Amino acid sequence: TRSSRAGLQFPVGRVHRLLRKGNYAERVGAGAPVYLAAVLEYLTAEILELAGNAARDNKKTRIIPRHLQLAVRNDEELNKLLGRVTIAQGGVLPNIQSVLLPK
C-alpha cells in the first residue's frame, strides 16, 4: 500500500484517484495525496477527539450526531472551519440571553 509507508490509516490511492479524476489539474505530483490524506486523517482525529470526549461527558459509548455538533460548536476553530456548515440531528448549544428571567 502507501498508508503504512506514510504512517496513515486513510486511503492514499482513493484520495489520489479523486485528485486526478476530480479535474483539479493536468498532472498531480505523488506527495499531494499523502500530504492531503494526512490532513484529512488529522482533521478526522480532531473531530473524533472532541466528539469522544462529548460522548463520555454525555455518558455514552456510541458517538451520535449530538456529540459531533457539540464538539464542533465547543471549539472556535472547528466552528470557524464549519461556520456555513450544519449537521443533521445536531441541535444547538444551550444559550439564554441573561435578561430573560422570571423577575
Partner 1 sequence: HRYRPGTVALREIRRYQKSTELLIRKLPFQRLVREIAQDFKTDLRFQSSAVMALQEASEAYLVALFEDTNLCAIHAKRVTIMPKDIQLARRIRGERA
Partner 2 sequence: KTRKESYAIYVYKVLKQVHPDTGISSKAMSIMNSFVNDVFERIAGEASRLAHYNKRSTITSREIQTAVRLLLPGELAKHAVSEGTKAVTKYTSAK
Partner 3 sequence: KVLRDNIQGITKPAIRRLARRGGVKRISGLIYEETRGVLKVFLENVIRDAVTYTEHAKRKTVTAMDVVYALKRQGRTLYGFGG
Q: Is 84 in the site for partner 3 (CB under 8 A)?
A: yes
Shortest distance in whole angstroms from residue 33 CB to a second copy: 17
Q: Which of 26, 92, 93, 95 binds partner 2 (CB under 8 A)?
A: 26
Position 91 contacts DNA (CB under 7 A): no
CB proximity list for 2: less than 8 A, separation 6 or greater: 8, 12, 13, 33, 34
**CA nearest 93: which of 81, 101, 76, 102?**
76
Position 69, amino acid: Q
| Interface with partner 2 (CB under 8 A) | 2, 4-12, 14-15, 18-19, 22-32, 34-49, 51-53, 55-56, 61-65, 67-68, 75-78, 80-82, 85, 87-89
